[PDB]
Amino acid sequence: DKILVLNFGSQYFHLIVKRLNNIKIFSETKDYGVELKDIKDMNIKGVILSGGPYSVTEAGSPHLKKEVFEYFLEKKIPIFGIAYGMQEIAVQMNGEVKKSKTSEYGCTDVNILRNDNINNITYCRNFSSAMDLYSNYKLMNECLFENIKSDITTVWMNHNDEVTKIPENFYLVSSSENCLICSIYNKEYNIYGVQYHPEVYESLDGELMFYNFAYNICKCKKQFDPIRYHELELKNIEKYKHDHYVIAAMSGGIDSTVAAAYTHKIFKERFFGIFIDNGLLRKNEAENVYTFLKSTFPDMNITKIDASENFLSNLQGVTDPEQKRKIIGKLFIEEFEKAVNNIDIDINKTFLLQGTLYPDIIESKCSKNLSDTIKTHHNLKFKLFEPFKYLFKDDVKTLSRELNLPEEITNRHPFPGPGLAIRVIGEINKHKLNILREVDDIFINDLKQYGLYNQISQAFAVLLSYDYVCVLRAVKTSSFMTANWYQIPYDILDKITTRILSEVKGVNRILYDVSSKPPATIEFE
Amino acid sequence: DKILVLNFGSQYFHLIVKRLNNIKIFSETKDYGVELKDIKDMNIKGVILSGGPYSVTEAGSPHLKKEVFEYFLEKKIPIFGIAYGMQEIAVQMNGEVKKSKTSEYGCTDVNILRNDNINNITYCRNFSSAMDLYSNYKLMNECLFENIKSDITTVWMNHNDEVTKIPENFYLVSSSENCLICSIYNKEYNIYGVQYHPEVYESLDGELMFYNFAYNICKCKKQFDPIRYHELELKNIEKYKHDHYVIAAMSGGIDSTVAAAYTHKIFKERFFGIFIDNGLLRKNEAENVYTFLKSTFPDMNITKIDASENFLSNLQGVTDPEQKRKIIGKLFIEEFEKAVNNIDIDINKTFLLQGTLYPDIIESKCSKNLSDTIKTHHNLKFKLFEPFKYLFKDDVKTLSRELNLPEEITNRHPFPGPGLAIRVIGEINKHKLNILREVDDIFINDLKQYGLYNQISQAFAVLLSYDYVCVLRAVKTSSFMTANWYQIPYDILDKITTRILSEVKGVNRILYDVSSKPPATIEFE
């Protein structure tokens, strides 16, 4: 089952192939000007159209023959157009493509469209209501996007021309802030179209859309099941389990606690657990995180650090978020090294274990904004060990269940690097932290009691013997650069605010953030 | 139909009579030790028990005979106990009254109880859940409180002993923060009990509960209908319509615009309208308020003032709310006098028209907190003219409809004295006002568009080319010292926040206040 791929001049053409090789599907390359005789004798159950530096309507521009396109639809050959490829599918099928209003380059989020998802569009006036615009186009109920987490997906943009008129009898599937008709799907001829480049590493769900295309749509008979795994990288390092050591910043997050779980199984004695209580943690996490780790991992060597006093004194006076982040970052590297320099081992023979995920890499790769980022800490040059570099968050959740670990660790909302520092606005103090912790803990303990925690991506509190003002944050994260605010039922919401202003001393006003990202952010500072 | 009133030593006993005389019901006085023979020959269709400096259970304390109480219930004579009077009704009917945990003195709000109203109680742990406590007592569906605006009512407290055990087969009707079983009602014997003193001027709904008691419960045949009126005071001043003049601070509020409407009819030429644009007003109120007034009152002499520049320069640097209020107040008296000193008339022969209401007097009388107060401005000694001194807000709404005035003026939320000054936190600027006005106007224009404005007591925005944070305020006011926060439907709420962060330049975050009063307030500063 060879899937045919055609080149139009895309600088990402090899990535299109490399994607197929990672998902272990056979592939054969031909250009955009192949005579039918060369692809008729071959068994082909799919077609892919690449991008190209040319304009889809200008003179001398690369295209396909008229009779070769009428060869696919009759033989039931699913088509897939990328960027310039999508534009080619439009032009040949009575669709109009002209120069766009504004170009698109870099990381970009696109909205999957149902008749339900239409409400999630804010940019209606960019090209002026929600349904007032999508009444001109078709929709449906969700097949390319089978098994996708959210209705958003981060993709790689590189183009200046977009589609202007949807081809004959097509469904509009996706839209972006600067490209309305971004993705299409013909149910009749089983054709898919996309303006972005899913093959690019920056595109998060690129391999997922390819797996659904060739397997679940083109019906290729697999023949290659295992392939890429979290254990493949682990089975590799097994050949170093006596030569070197492995250290890890035990933070308490699911990413660090289930990465250390396997790396302790390999380096049973050569593994060092380093947990640092910066004093910027939540209520009782100074002990509960440590106590839990020692209990669940008895054989694991754990070194607990209390540099909280070194964090407070160094943050005194500092009110600017950037310098507050700069201090915490440049101080975390110190207390970590100092801890490593308490356990005498070969520095040139040791690994740096970092539960790093595929989305974490791109979030750092595609430099957009790093205020809401979680993995912050990502004079000693280590050989970095990131076995989950090609893995997802939902994946890690599955492994943590296989290890008989509780659900408490897999439901735990992602707690960022700088901690409560960017949650205490202005001057930071040990007193303000105490007040914020009392408020934050009540807020969380209730969300658990009434069962809303699991339905929220991330929830916390912000502080704005003086009486202070508190803000309650609760979001529904779709991508690392876009999120909504969770709509807490009022009856439940009322109880929390009632139980905070009554019990906690030092607060007389509670606010709830009702601003989305963009243009806002998850974290205040 | 004489209503019997009994004295126990209350210092407010005459007020109990004075209330009856205002509602024009016949009354006859006897003490707490009347022999039955004196009240049997008299036609009595009601009974009232007053307070007293004594304790209801101590030795030598004033009480009633056992056979005189068994005289009412058989002859169908409705009873009404006040403070010590209520405590007497309890003791004689197998109810227990002991010294309270904490005393109560001054203005106090009490909660009317249904099975619905139980959720409005926050002080459950003062004597620990909502229904967990009121499951021991009885409730019902709302007769003493016929035609009452809210489920709260401001009353006058003076006592140290409260009831501890509800008398045989009684309904619990009201509760306070320091007195659980505050008001009772026996459906069997038609008996009512109250810990507070409704006869006191400070008690807002004192005359209302008396009108329902004697008329709607005791069935007295009226014989006196007109009595107190808004026109009685107006018909009085008619004897000065040539001797003196009348000036009024035209603000734009319903209280000033429908008070000037009548006073212009009397002093057709001797009346002066003074509207001051302090620059702290809402969007376009600098002209819309003036233009409306001149149009609806063509014959009325109106003097428009633009002291906005005198308000800004004087408020520069001032960030403390108290001094911000102190400046505005001490400056409003200046621009008003200066305006009066532009119209040469006899200063010793002029009236000061002030649309003042009965609740406004008590709000100032019972000095609790004046941050949320509306009537703020309440070297020239005038003869004050307050014809609505004994009138309610709901009353004024009825008169403004009789004058064929639009609903726009009767739905207009009460806009306070200091204006947008206490809504711009910190340094005040002409720039910040522009940004706040754009946000506030959008917020209001939407509440009108989606029809929530009328269901809200008061709604506005607060600001916290720099990007600033905005807070949206929307409350359900029950009393001038207690209020909830309105629960805006999310779909509607989402649109507003979406339309502010997109259209308004200078804001990147929107918050919504979810704190009630107490312990918070309506206004930030």
Ligand SMILES: NC(=O)CC[C@H](N)C(=O)O
């Ligand atoms: N990457 C691309 O395909 C961009 C090519 C060309 N600029 C276009 O408008 O499509």
Ligand SMILES: NC(=O)CC[C@H](N)C(=O)O
């Ligand atoms: N005003 C009153 O009736 C108070 C009297 C007395 N102190 C009591 O506890 O009732």
